[PDB]
Structure 1
Amino acid sequence: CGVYDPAQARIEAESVKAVQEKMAGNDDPHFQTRATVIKEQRAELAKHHVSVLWSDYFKPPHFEKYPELHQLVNDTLKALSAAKGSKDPATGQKALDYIAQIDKIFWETKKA
C-alpha cells in the first residue's frame, strides 16, 4: 500500500496460456486433468491481481482521466474467465492483451 504491479497478473496469465499450450502436446488424461486444475487456480489468481489493482491502486482521478478503465478491467476479468474455461491458447493470449492495456495505463499513472 500503495505498492502494486500488473506484472503479478501478467505472470499468472502467462501460466494460463503456457498450460493451454501444453494441453495440445500430451493426450494423457491424468496430464490433461492436472493441467486443468493448475489452469483454474492460476486464472483465478490472475483475476484477483487484476481486481486488486482496480479497487486498491486506481483512484477517482485515474477513472476520470481514463473513462475506459472500468470497462477495460471488467473485460480483462471476463477474458481470464474465458481462458479458464478453454484449452485454446488464443483465449489466454486475449487475456494477456487486455492485461498489457492495463499495464500501459498503470505505468502512466506512476508518471503523473
Structure 2
Amino acid sequence: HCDLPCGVYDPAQARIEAESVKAIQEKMAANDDLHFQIRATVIKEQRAELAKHHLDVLWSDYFKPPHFESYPELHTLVNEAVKALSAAKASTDPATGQKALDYIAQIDKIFWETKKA
C-alpha cells in the first residue's frame, strides 16, 4: 500500500478509520457542547480523509484490470464508498458513517476473494 510496491494491503486500514468516523458521530449525538462539537468535527474530518485515502490506494494500487473485469461493479462500489465518506464528513448522523462502513464491507469481501486466487 506504500507503492514500492510492498505487496501488503488490507481494507482494515480503511475500515478502522471509518469506524472512528462513525464512533465520533455517535459521540456527537450525546454531547452538544460547542467546543466538543468543534473538536469532533475536526477529527472526524481527518479520519474520513484517511479512510478515503486507504480506499483510493486499494483502487489504484492493489486492484488490477483482471479484477475490474471479474467484478464489473468494483469501480462504482469504491467510488460510492469514498463519496459516502465525504457525506459522512458533512454529517453528524451515524447513518452516514454506517453507509460508508457497509460499502467498505463489500469492498473487503471482494478484496479477500481476489486474495484466494
Smaller-chain TM-score bracket:
over 0.9
Give the partner amino acid of 2:84.
A
Query: Structure 2 length as normaliser, TM-score?
Result: 0.95
CA drift of 1:51 comes to 0.3
| Structure 1 ranges of 4+ moved more than 2 A | none
1:110 to 98, 105, 115: 115
| Consecutive unaligned residues in structure 2, runs of 5 or more | 1-5
Query: Structure 1 length as normaliser, TM-score?
Result: 0.99
| Consecutive unaligned residues in structure 1, runs of 5 or more | none
Aligned to 1:5: 10
Give the Cα separation in 1 of the matches to 2:100 and 2:25: 13
Deviations for 1:4-56, whole angstroms, at most 9, x for unmatched residues?
00000000000000000000111110000000000000000000000000000
Following superposition of structure 1 onto structure 2, how do residues 56-75 of structure 1 map, counting pairs within 5 Å? 56-75=61-80
- State the aligned residue count: 112
Give the Cα separation in 2 of the matches to 1:8 and 1:16: 13
- Amino-acid identity (%): 88
